[PDB]
Amino acid sequence: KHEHGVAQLNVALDGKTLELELDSPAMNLVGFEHAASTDADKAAVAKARAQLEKPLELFALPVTAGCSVASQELRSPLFGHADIHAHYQLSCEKPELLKLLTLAEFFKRFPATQKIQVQLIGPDGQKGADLAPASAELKL
Ligand SMILES: [Zn+2]
Ligand SMILES: [Zn+2]
According to the entry, how was the structure determined? X-ray
Q: Cβ(72)–Cβ(55) under 8 Å?
A: yes
Coil, strand, or helix at residue 20? strand
For residue 99, give Cα distances in angstroms to 65, 73, 105.
10, 26, 17
Q: How far is the CA of 119 from the centre of ligand 2 (A)?
A: 15
Resolution of the structure, angstroms:
2.8
In one letter, which amino acid is 8? Answer: Q
The CA-to-CA distance between both ends of the chain, in Å, stands at 25
Q: How far is the CA of 34 from the centre of ligand 1 (A)?
A: 9
For residue 2, give Cα distances in angstroms to 6, 22, 50, 72, 108.
8, 13, 23, 23, 22
User: Starting at the edge strand that comes first in sequence, how are the strands of the sheet with 83-92 ordered?
Assistant: 67-75, 83-92, 17-25, 6-14, 115-122, 125-131
Q: Which residues are near ligand 2, the ion (C-beta closer than 5 Å)?
A: 87
Distance CA 16, CA 65 (A): 9
Residues sharing a CB contact under 8 Å with residue 59, sequence separation 6 or more, in sequence order:
20, 101, 102, 103, 105, 106
Please provide the size of the chain in residues: 140
